[PDB]
Amino acid sequence: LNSRVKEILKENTLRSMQDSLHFKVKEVQGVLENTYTSMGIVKEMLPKDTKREIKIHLLKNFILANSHVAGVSMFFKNREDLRLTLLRDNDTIKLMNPLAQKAMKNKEISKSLPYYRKMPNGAEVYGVDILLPLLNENAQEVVGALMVFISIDSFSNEITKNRSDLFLIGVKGKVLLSANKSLQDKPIAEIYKSVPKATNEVLTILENGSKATLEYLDPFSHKENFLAVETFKMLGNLNWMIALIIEKD
Ligand SMILES: [Cl-]
Prior knowledge:
The protein is 33% helix and 31% strand. By secondary structure, it is an alpha+beta fold. It has 2 domains: 46-152, PAS domain (Beta-Lactamase, 2-Layer Sandwich); 160-247, Beta-Lactamase. The chain has a 6-stranded antiparallel beta sheet with strand order 3-2-1-6-5-4. It has a 5-stranded antiparallel beta sheet with strand order 8-7-11-10-9, with helices on both faces. A hairpin with a 3-residue loop joins strand 2 (84-88) and strand 3. Residues 114, 170-171 line the site of chloride ion (CL). It is classed as signaling protein. Keywords: chemoreceptor, helix bundle, PAS/Cache, signaling protein. It forms a monomeric assembly.
């Protein structure tokens, strides 16, 4: 049978891979729908006819209350006095946007591309911004806006601490985080040039927002791998995805 069973063994493995991965994905999700809420609080309170001294603490608290959050920032249309921008030194520091606007012009909220933000010590952090229009007591008029800078790098906790077999992949297939940092901000279609059968199945699932398994010769290991991949809407509409690889052995 050694092939009848090599094939049942395969099934056994991919099943538990997807089980594990599905847990890995649940993890990373609730770490952000917690924030989007622990956030959200913030949206309603801030635009209160309260004071700059008040709101700072409000924001300075919400950063502290969300590890993977690395900064925030505030605007108010003609009340220009109310600009400010708080970031990560190891406490917060105060330092010194057609999307922010755009989502005011909506009252729907939006995200950005991943990008690298230089930080008060000098260090550059990969992250996305999450915009959040600020609106009036009646909520038919647009006040200012908020901006929460989510460190993608902060998720090495979930992604790369003591394992190195997971990948976080965001839009059109750009590796967002991975044990090897050479890959951050490069798209899978070029990292894995060698296996378009594979990257086209991954880019497809990403688009459709689903899960699958498959195999590919890895170009770093030079050996065949099993791959399980699974998606989730990063705000709680477009997908991020996590990948879990296992060398056949
Ligand atoms: Cl993304």
